[PDB]
């Protein structure tokens, strides 16, 4: 009783890994044991199994393996994501998550921060690279209501830059091999140096800030979330050590920026190929709950007042989920992940991307199809896990507020004498990437 084994030794190499983990499915089925690295890792490729070992069992495949690459960022140690399970992490998640849920509703700021962006782009009328503009749109936003609420392009462009440079340094064979070949002796490798050096800015920018927060403190929450966490820790009613706050900020402070940006960028790349969905959206937008051209409705309760949107976003998050294989889960108790018994400690890899192409539940999976509301099944882009996501709300929101006014203000047009991007890069890393388009950005309603 155990999942099958694929006869390979470095499946990790090879393009479009998510589409490959799917290919093996033709014979094996949803669950198969595979060697992504040098160790046999059990994958899952179906909305059913990837949900059974995530929601049903819950207790079992909830932890995360500590590989020699995670404890590299441990510092004092502990935190969201990388950190393993343990009762501390549980209470650690609940604290840094309630912050994102917050007398200071983050709803308004988001809808405003994006407006400034529209104008900033509206003055361009040229061919700005969307990736940075939006890749900086969210940064200008998570930075306002999470750490000292600076928002200033002086402290934002500094934190935003720390994000991108903190990614290509963690997701590079140079630093990855260290995990596959631990016995390596860690002969000096160039990548490790570039990481340790860039990982400091991430530790420093939070240390120099967390202090200002410490002193400028009052009875409740300061402008930002830091004041909440940095306070909701030194008052625990009985671990949750002070250091935890330093890390909790990181995921959101410098983690919020990349993931959501990619989703937004991907969506734009799709509308470029489908003008149909673009204008059908422009009409369904104002002729649905926005008879005007601005500052009218466009929110939460209304959120239903916009069908094509709640749909378009659902597709983009299903065809190109920003995080595809999500993160590696580890088993704590021997349990069955379906079909076959699974040994404890076994690293589980929930193939989200693949489960989204299950043609047994989603029709014409490969085809951008906005339509689904009526209704079509749900697609897990944020996982469904005791780890689920810690900011699924913030994310889901930005994709609504940003896209909404993105269409209304501008046309969304292709670069001059250029080809539209798409299809997905082979250098798939922690978060799924995108090619570099140059969308035009104009409209005169």
The binder of 41, among ligand 3QZ, ligand HEM, none, by C-beta within 5 to 8 A per type, is ligand 3QZ
Nearby residues of 355 by Cβ (< 8 Å), 6 or more positions away: 44, 45, 46, 47, 50, 379, 380
Q: Is 37 in the site for ligand HEM (CB under 6 A)?
A: no
Question: Pick from 114, 130, 102: which is nearest to 401 by CA?
Answer: 114
Under DSSP, the state recorded for 55 is I
CB 409 within 8 A of CB 117: no
CB atoms within 10 A of CB 277: 20
Q: Which does 383 bind (CB under 5 to 8 A by kind): ligand HEM, ligand 3QZ, none?
A: ligand HEM
The answer to whether residues 400 and 297 touch, using CB atoms and an 8 Å cutoff, is no
Residue 409 binding result from ligand 3QZ, ligand HEM, none, given CB thresholds of 5 to 8 Å by partner type: none
Q: Is 202 annotated as a binding residue?
A: yes
CB nearer ligand HEM, residue 69 or residue 259: 259
Element (H, E) at 198: helix 190-215
**Residue 381 interacts with, from ligand 3QZ, ligand HEM, none (CB under 5-8 Å by kind):** ligand HEM
In the complex, minimum distance from the CB of residue 46 to ligand 3QZ, in angstroms, rounded to a whole number: 17
359 CB-contact burial (10 Å; exposed 0-12 / middle 13-18 / buried 19+): exposed
Residue 169 found at the interface with ligand HEM (CB under 6 A): no
Q: Is 362 in the site for ligand HEM (CB under 6 A)?
A: no
* Gap between the Cα atoms of 165 and 157, Å rounded: 12
> Binding site annotation covers 387?
yes
Q: Which of 205, 269, 346, 381 binds ligand HEM (CB under 6 A)?
A: 381
Q: Which two tokens stand for residue 440?
A: 């035009």
Q: Which two tokens stand for residue 14?
A: 């090879």
Interacting positions 220-279 with ligand HEM (CB under 6 A):
251-252, 255-256, 259-260, 263
Structural element, H or E, at residue 41? strand 41-44
414: DSSP letter: P
Helices 243-273, 392-409: inter-axial angle, 10-degree rounding:
40
Partner from ligand HEM, ligand 3QZ, none contacting 100, C-beta within 5 to 8 A by type:
ligand HEM
Nearer to ligand 3QZ, 202 or 213 (CB): 202
Nearer to ligand 3QZ by Cβ, of 228 and 382: the residue is 382
Question: What is the binding site for ligand 3QZ (CB under 6 A)?
Answer: 12, 36-39, 41, 65, 67, 73, 81-82, 166, 170, 176, 179-180, 199, 202, 251, 255, 258-259, 323, 325, 328, 347, 349, 430-431
Instruction: Provide, rounded to whole angstroms, the least separation between the CB of residue 69 and ligand 3QZ.
Output: 7
Q: Which of 192, 217, 289, 327 binds ligand HEM (CB under 6 A)?
A: 327
Q: Which is nearer to ligand 3QZ, 51 or 258 (CB)?
A: 258
3-state secondary structure 139-179: HHHHCCCCCCCCCCHHHHHHHHHHHHCCCCCCCCHHHHHHH
Task: Kindly state the tokens that stand for 213.
Answer: 């927060």
CB of 442 to ligand HEM, least distance (A): 27
Query: Least Å distance between CB 39 and ligand HEM?
Result: 18
- Based on its alpha-carbon atoms, the radius of gyration of the chain, rounded to whole angstroms, reads 22
Give me the least distance between CB of 49 and ligand HEM, in Å please.
Answer: 14
Would you list the DSSP string of 271-321?
A: HHH-HHHHHHHHHHHHHHH-SSSSSS--STTGGGS-HHHHHHHHHHHHHS-
Sign of the dihedral through C-alpha 169, 173, 176, 182? negative
The answer to whether residue 434 forms part of the interface with ligand HEM (CB under 6 A) is no
Q: Identify residues 385-424 at the interface with ligand HEM (CB under 6 A).
A: 385, 387, 389-391, 394-395, 399
- Residue from 222, 382, 400, 428 touching ligand HEM (CB under 6 A): that is 382
Q: Which is nearer to ligand 3QZ, 142 or 298 (CB)?
A: 142
Measured CA distances, 280 to 226, 362, 414 (Å): 41, 23, 18
User: Residue 195 is encoded by which pair of tokens?
Assistant: 């990481």
Q: Which is nearer to ligand 3QZ, 328 or 414 (CB)?
A: 328
Q: Confirm or reject binding of residue 323 to ligand HEM (CB under 6 A).
A: yes
**309: contact with ligand HEM by CB under 6 A:** no
Smallest Cα–Cα separation from 350: which of 317, 328, 381, 321? 328
Q: Does position 281 bind ligand HEM by CB under 6 A?
A: no
Q: Which residues are annotated as a binding site for heme b?
A: 81, 329, 387, 389
Using CB under 6 A, list all residues that contact ligand HEM. Answer: 80-81, 93, 100, 251-252, 255-256, 259-260, 263, 317, 321-323, 326-327, 350, 352, 381-383, 385, 387, 389-391, 394-395, 399
Q: Which residues are annotated as a binding site?
A: 81, 202, 329, 387, 389
């Amino acid at each position: 009783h155990l999942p099958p084994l694929v006869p390979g030794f470095l499946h990790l190499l090879q393009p479009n890994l998510p589409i490959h983990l799917l290919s093996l499915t033709q014979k094996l089925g949803p669950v198969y044991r595979l060697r992504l690295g040098l160790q046999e890792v059990v994958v899952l490729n179906s909305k059913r199994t990837i949900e059974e070992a995530m929601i049903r069992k819950w207790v079992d495949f909830a932890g995360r393996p500590q590989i020699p690459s995670y404890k590299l960022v441990s510092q004092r140690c502990q935190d969201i994501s990388l950190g393993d399970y343990s009762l501390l992490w549980k209470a650690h998640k609940k604290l840094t998550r309630s912050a994102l849920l917050l007398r200071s509703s983050m709803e308004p700021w988001v809808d405003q921060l994006t407006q400034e962006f529209c104008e900033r782009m509206r003055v361009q009328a040229g061919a700005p690279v969307t990736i940075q503009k939006e890749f900086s749109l969210l940064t200008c936003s998570i930075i306002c209501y999470l750490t000292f609420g600076n928002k200033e392009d002086t402290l934002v462009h500094a934190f935003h830059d720390c994000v991108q440079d903190l990614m290509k340094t963690w997701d590079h064979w140079s630093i990855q091999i260290l995990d596959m070949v631990p016995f390596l002796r860690f002969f000096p490798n160039p990548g490790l140096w570039r990481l340790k050096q860039a990982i400091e800015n991430r530790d420093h920018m939070v240390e120099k800030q967390l202090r200002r927060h410490k002193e400028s403190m009052v009875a409740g929450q300061w402008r930002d979330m830091t004041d909440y966490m940095l306070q909701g820790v030194g008052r625990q009613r009985v671990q949750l050590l002070e250091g935890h706050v330093h890390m909790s900020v990181v995921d959101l402070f410098i983690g919020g920026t990349e993931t959501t940006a990619s989703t937004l960028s991907w969506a734009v790349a799709f509308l470029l190929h489908h003008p149909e969905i673009q204008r059908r959206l422009q009409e369904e937008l104002d002729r649905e709950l926005g008879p005007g051209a601005s500052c009218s409705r466009v929110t939460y309760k209304d959120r239903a007042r916009l069908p094509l949107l709640n749909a378009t976003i659902a597709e983009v998050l299903r065809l190109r989920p920003v995080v595809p294989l999500a993160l590696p889960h580890r088993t704590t108790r021997p349990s069955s992940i379906f079909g076959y018994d699974i040994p404890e400690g076994m690293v589980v890899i929930p193939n989200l991307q693949g489960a989204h192409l299950d043609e047994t539940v989603w029709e014409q999976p490969h085809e951008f199809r906005p339509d689904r509301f009526l209704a079509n099944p749900s697609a897990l882009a944020f996982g469904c896990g005791a780890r689920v996501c810690l900011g699924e709300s913030l994310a889901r929101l930005e994709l609504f507020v940003v896209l909404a006014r993105l269409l209304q203000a501008f046309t969304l047009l292709p670069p001059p004498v250029g080809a539209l991007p798409s299809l997905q890069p082979d250098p798939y890393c922690g978060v799924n990437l995108k090619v570099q388009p140059f969308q035009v950005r104009l409209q005169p309603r």
